[PDB]
Design brief:
This is part of a larger assembly, with two copies of chain A (62 residues). Chain A is mainly α and 62 residues long. Chain A contains three helices and no strands. Chain A has helices at residues 15-25, 32-46, 52-61. In chain A, helix 2 packs antiparallel against helix 3. The interface between A and B is small, with 2 and 6 residues. Chain B: This is Lon protease homolog, mitochondrial. Chain B: It is found in: Mitochondrion matrix. Chain B: Belongs to the peptidase S16 family.
């Protein structure tokens, strides 16, 4: 905590949100899929990094 | 706690006022470095205690 990521680098786990969104931002897309995507993103935010649920969520979102 | 270089420089200070002032400045350096370490340690100690206190608040709510 003292380094506050000034000794390590941002894990980018939160950056996965924007990474996927920009990976999708450019696509003209229906709406139901957007709300499903938002729900999956919210679950990702809630789900811990090490969880198997989290891993399957990551694969599904990929 | 300074390295041998600072001690050698203190030796190099021929005039008593110069070496005494260098020693006092190095004491200030030691105190301020220890102050940085103490401040960071206390900060993260309170932060971790508060992290556990968050779970304590959770259990109180339960």
């Amino acid at each position: 905590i003292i380094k506050k990521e000034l000794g390590l680098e941002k894990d980018d786990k939160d950056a996965i949100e924007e990474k996927f969104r920009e990976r999708l931002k450019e696509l003209v897309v229906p709406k139901h899929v957007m709300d499903v995507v938002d729900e999956e993103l919210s679950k990702l935010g809630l789900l811990d990094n090490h969880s198997s649920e989290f891993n399957v969520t990551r694969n599904y979102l990929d | 706690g300074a390295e041998s270089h600072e001690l050698q420089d203190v030796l190099e200070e021929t005039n008593i006022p110069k070496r005494l002032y260098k020693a006092l400045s190095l004491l200030k350096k030691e105190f301020e470095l220890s102050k940085l370490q103490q401040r960071l340690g206390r900060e993260v100690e309170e932060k971790i205690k508060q992290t556990h206190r968050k779970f304590l608040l959770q259990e109180q709510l339960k």
